Symmetry: C3
Subunit: 318 residues, 3 copies
């Protein structure tokens, strides 16, 4: 009978701290039919990353824009400069030149996201203004730039929507956990799954932002090798006293490893002075190495250690 003095369970604190940094992003076209001007071709969410005015949204919200417009919850509207984008992650960065003072996403670089943590997925879009949803972290993501990985997304059961994808995934304190990404069949804002949605983990989103600001695109390194891990894996003892490694299957012809030269069954033990313990770790490592770089790769060949010297190239198209 006395609700009066009680307090409803709520996540409005996360909302108050994070939402003013989450922006409407508009993709405007100039028509060809009757004379021209101001058509909205699509609409999406973006997140203000720093003072200075860099913003992340989805590449799919900005593709083929003639002009990119940004509107804040406080009423200010800006025209945006496209800094660059990346297909594999569906992220783009924009920049805005502003008037004394922007609201920014809270970010805690020391926070470790845990499976089971509560998250809110904050956008705007639909009926009017804002869709916000609640769920949990289902699976932590990896932070790699390797173009074949399938585990570089945090997964959540918070609904991720067209009113969702360009925006912020945050925990109950309003700290950024990831960038919302509409979730896996193709062409601006509605999908097939249900249950599970995806975001770019925030330390990956930050990495990719710094890459775009500095090169205009995500430059990924490449070694030109396919292969599987030798010694049977896991069970933390069972045991220690034999060296792991990557047996080589495939050597891209006229790839960096082929040049150099490296042959099918010869067993990679070390790459750029790190032990080659896992196929997956090692291809993420190679991906961050700048092209033009010369690195040592140690192999065992006929019971002998060879050190070859390899010059990294860029991962090549599609």
């Amino acid at each position: 009978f006395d609700s009066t003095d009680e307090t409803p369970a709520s996540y409005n604190l996360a909302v108050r701290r994070a939402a003013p940094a989450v922006v409407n992003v508009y993709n405007r076209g100039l028509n060809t039919n009757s004379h021209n001007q101001l058509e909205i071709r699509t609409l999406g969410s973006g997140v203000i990353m720093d003072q200075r005015g860099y913003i992340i949204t989805n590449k799919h919200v900005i593709n083929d824009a003639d002009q990119i417009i940004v509107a804040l919850q406080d009423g200010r509207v800006f025209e945006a400069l496209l800094v660059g984008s990346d297909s594999l992650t569906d992220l783009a960065v924009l920049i805005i030149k502003a008037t004394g003072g922007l609201p920014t996403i809270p970010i805690n670089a020391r926070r470790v996201p845990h499976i089971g943590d509560v998250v809110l997925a904050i956008g705007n879009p639909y009926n009017l203004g804002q869709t916000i949803t609640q769920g949990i972290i289902s699976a932590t993501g990896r932070i790699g730039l390797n173009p074949t990985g399938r585990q570089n997304f945090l997964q959540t059961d918070a609904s991720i929507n067209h009113g969702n994808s360009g925006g912020a995934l945050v925990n109950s304190l309003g700290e950024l956990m990831g960038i919302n990404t509409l979730s896996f069949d193709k062409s601006n804002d509605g999908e097939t799954p249900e249950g599970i949605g995806f975001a770019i983990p925030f330390q990956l989103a930050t990495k990719i932002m710094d890459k775009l600001i500095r090169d205009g695109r995500v430059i990924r390194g490449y070694i030109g090798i396919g292969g599987r891990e030798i010694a049977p894996l896991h069970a933390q003892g069972g045991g220690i006293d034999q060296l792991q490694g990557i047996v080589v299957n495939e050597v891209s012809p006229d790839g960096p490893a082929a040049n150099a030269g490296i042959q099918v069954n010869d067993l990679i033990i070390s790459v750029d002075n790190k032990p080659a313990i896992s196929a997956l770790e090692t291809m993420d490592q190679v991906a961050e190495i700048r092209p033009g770089s010369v690195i040592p790769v140690v192999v065992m060949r006929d019971d002998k250690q060879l050190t070859l010297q390899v010059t990294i190239q860029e991962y090549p198209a599609t």
Copy 2:
């Protein structure tokens, strides 16, 4: 190892306080094929609003009923009188004559719903008896009766279902936040969206109930004008010293404004002594004014203030 003395996180308190007021609503037909009697043509949820026995459900659960039956969780069954309904909101009110004492929905007219608050959507229906779901408020709704608005629904990610729609949306204390409404493609109990569901905000649901009890239907006022707001909007300073207003586009021919008479480019500054600051506010205001009413409308016409006097009519069909 010691779960024994701990307490599981739970919303069962909201359930215990609110659920006994949430009722099964049955729509029974008399057949035409073999001889007649007792067929259930559809089934839905309703909410007991006050002692006295008024109940809200969905119009779609009650349309074309020959007889309306109500069953409580405590075993009592009643036949219901249809008091009236409204298509635009998909609400209907019923009344029941009862035996000493009904369980009623807790309602707190002082509570302000916040974006991020936890809500449970309580029904009965399917497999047997009750579907209850949990989510958050995604967007607060407006409380207007203007028939073109698209923001008069609270939005939630709690699942809203056929076992859901006639019932109560409540917060963690069991206070009513809204009426569940199945959610946007047509004909008794299953839908297309996912992600986002809808309810009538509770102060709108209460308003519409009092309207039905007193007139048998929702009588909406009408002025017979389409138009857009002049001076560029928002940013809380930028600035103060010029009067907002509604420029007139369209004047319904032989509508109230046309009678009176009011012409295309002439700029509404005030309606029924309230400043005309926003298109949306002003059309909600007109909607609550009783038909037959004579009100002053101030315009600026050729740099001159005219006051016309306008007699409100009812908003007309479909």
Copy 3:
């Protein structure tokens, strides 16, 4: 500005206590096209029930396996023996012979699941490793083995998926509340509903496990009678002073009741010395009675009490 010392709302405690008992279950076939070996025909989740190595998964994950493989989160892999299964519940039990010490699901036989309690649905499967989701208990289930019941499932809005169904439903303390069951259209791992998902309640899952370990299958008793409850039901007074009972409709011909012999309108008042108060209770009771058993059934026939003696048979195919 100070997130630093605060703590994010989270269910990671339930995860840490329950997840190490939730296993990958693989169904491997030997090919017929090119020469043979190791194909994965489907993949699912299972739950370790006790030391000793009994595991529950879904019957649908194991059907037609040539070999059943089990992988723990700690890296250990086992080959599994199929102990038995049950179509009506989509459960199977497996057994594994292990090396000093298994992680087991926490189970609290004294805990009473409440409508509104938070639950996590823990699996592994998809992109890589784990899907976990969060929701509430929507409806408590019954624990009966009667093959026509439709209320023997707990219902939840936690998403239940292919990365879900063989695994554990648990509350915020990590205690087992039920077995996840993909949720109602047919053939290994994706569905039609949305909103509502299903699990076997844990006291039913335990019952069915003990039955499989001891007989290799779920043996259900049968009486060979269809019928409805006499005196109008519910409202806890209204009143006490007349005996409930089951009027008999239908008597399976050459069923146990027919033998014995029992006739259409004659009114069951007691079964195996329990009052026959409810159709549903009484058919669950009959289902647990072992076949071969001789029990008294009291009826009222022409205002007279007859006691017949009935020998229970097994419920017969499909």
